[model samples]
Target: MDKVKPNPPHNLSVINSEELSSILKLTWTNPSIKSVIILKYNIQYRTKDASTWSQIPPEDTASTRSSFTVQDLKPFTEYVFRIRCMKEDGKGYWSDWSEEASGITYEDR
Candidate 1:
């Protein structure tokens, strides 16, 4: 039998500032709509002054939320982030990034 594939899903969900155990965890989920294709997600982030974005380390992919961590974050720095869902064909559109979740790395300063 020949392999068959399905169409892509619609209406993706996104949130970049939702709290997870006091950590700011970005989140994305499949919409309730049904489609012929399955869904997969990718995440990217970079600093405000950076010209390029880096995919979150592969380990994050193992998490329920595809969660990633940033360490040695400066006491008062800004960052940007985005997520996109794709079809099995490896082609699809990206969600307009969630509104920037601006914050100081810490308030104890």
Candidate 2:
């Protein structure tokens, strides 16, 4: 039998912040189908006006967690993020990139 590819994560969003900060807390739910046990996720982001995206360190995304915080972002700048997952053994097609979510970092103090 062939391995199944997971579906893209959905509901990608930035959680609200209570204090001014340069970090964005992003969260998403696993694929609805659950065809296979997902092992790790890959997250990518870029400033709203940039043409290229930057990936989070692989080690940081090597987990089944549903949320991650992206740091070192510019204050008061808009950014976009997307994520995808791979199979448990790390041998399979990566899920399609999730719909992009955008957030603006809090202004600098």
Candidate 3:
């Protein structure tokens, strides 16, 4: 049987707020379909009003994890994020971009 692309993550959310700096904690549920191979994820974000997306570092983007902390964001700014996953060996198609989630960074003290 041929391998197929995994489904995109669902219910992307901002799980934590930064109290003293510009950071956001994000989490999501894995694809509903089960897979024999492990999966790695990719994350991308942009300022709420920006036209382009910026990816997290490769080291962080290709991890078999469901959560990540985005750091060095601009204080008091709103950002939007999306995620997708593929097989761990990078041999399969990436899932479609997940539904978007947005959050605001804390104000600088």
Tell how far residue 36 is off in model 1, in angstroms: 12
Please identify which of the two predictions, 2 or 3, would achieve the higher TM-score against the true structure.
Answer: 2
Encode model 2's per-residue lDDT on 35-87: one tens digit a residue. 44545777888999997888885576665667887778888889788788765
Candidate 3 off by > 4 Å = 1-3, 32-36
**Would you list the clashing residue pairs of candidate 2?**
none
In every candidate, how many clashes are there? 4, 0, 0
The TM-scores of all predictions, comma-separated, are 0.48, 0.81, 0.80
- Which candidate model has the greater lDDT, 1 or 3? 3
**Taking the tens digit of each residue's C-alpha lDDT, what string does model 3 give over 1-109?**
9656788877799755638458888888778645455677778888999988998754765556677888888888888888888767857687777779897887776
For candidate 1, write residues 78-107 as lDDT tens digits. Answer: 555555544444444544433343333433
lDDT of 1: 0.44
